[PDB]
Amino acid sequence: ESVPIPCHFIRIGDILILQGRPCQVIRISVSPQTGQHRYLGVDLFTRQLQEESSFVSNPSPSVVVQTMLGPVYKTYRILDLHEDGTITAMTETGDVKQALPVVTQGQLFRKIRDAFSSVRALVINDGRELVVDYKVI
Template identity: 65%
Template sequence: MGYYDEEAGAAAVATPKQPANTVTIPCHHIRMGDLLMLQGRPCQVIRITTSAATGQHRYLGVDLFTRQLNEESSFIANPSPSVVVQTMLGPVFKQYRVLDLQDQSVVAMTETGDVKQAIPVLDQSNLWTRLREAFEGGRGSIRIMVVADGGREIAVDMKTVHGSRL
């Protein structure tokens, strides 16, 4: 039926299979300090560059676990003619309830009720100090946002839940 092959058209816009525990983020939403998956590792973005020739974004980040530098370019897709979408993969965050603080690490309860011991805390933005002050203040339930990678976990942010949302 003419020159258009439906199967070939669908294959032309197919994107690579997305790894587990990742979410797609449009490049125009990504800022310095955000967390991305660079070369399969959870990293904090420290530099963003854009190619003058192609407009493609390139990200440099520090691995949250090993402190090594990783760099990767954005994924480009053309879902329809004259439409270009650039995306990156970001980690999926888990939210745990803080039960106790011990030796610069957290004892927390998962969504399923399991207790996790000795979750390390990211050493940035006074996270440990904010966590300790909120926990000792005793107002509300303290939650940590956790990034997992290969069986290891690290707390990257926290929030206090008050009142009826406990």
Template identity: 25%
Template sequence: MADTDLDLTTGESGASATIPMQCSALRKNGYVVLKGRPCKIVEMSTSKTGKHGHAKVNMVGIDIFTNKKYEDMCPSTHNMDVPHIKRNEFQLLNITDGFMSLMGDNGDVREDLRVPDSDLGKEIEQKFAASEDILVSVLSAMGEECAVAIKQMTGGK
């Protein structure tokens, strides 16, 4: 008999937002979760094994969404979370009330992403006001999304 209480409408894959990886396997310019935030590793150093036997890895990372700096220290044999990061390119169609209308490769339009409160956001608005065709790179990780870069559209599309 089927269970009628199941809700199958969420469309979520059930995959975790992060995967565990041994601290010693992480590398500079890779990604890691520091203090609950997805970060790009900008510095790493390993201390020698001490009296109690574990080498410690000291990491400095920059939050991929807010550019805030985070530091953490972890024994090299312990696991740390590595975020699943997805990068997509969208064509900028319009800007309305601080939100961008973006079209993906498949023709789907989304209007749920804010113009960033940064120099990049100012640049996006300037190029849009000048009627330039631009592609917006959107980074997604751990349930968050943010426009991180733009580039001029080429005539090939």
């Protein structure tokens, strides 16, 4: 449900798993005490602020890596949209999700509506699924 990403690849606006919650990063800093990177983010569901420091590892001699956890993105085929902000989507295997919620970040629904009239929904799981991006394709 998550994937480790080297910290030097992460930038403001990226989605990370902060304290077990998918969050959009709004600030990145470095700890002068440990050298860890610090990520402040906005919970995509509750809009609460969360912070988490990076995980240091030493897998091989002279190889030290700083990572954060990023969410695994699922692409669903978009079948329909509704006037309440939800969409009807279908998984790769044919499972129909009747009312998937869409984030209000960057007016995502309006862009999906403009593209619908072959759009793919990029969905994040946190049991609750959430459309956080889209791809035309």
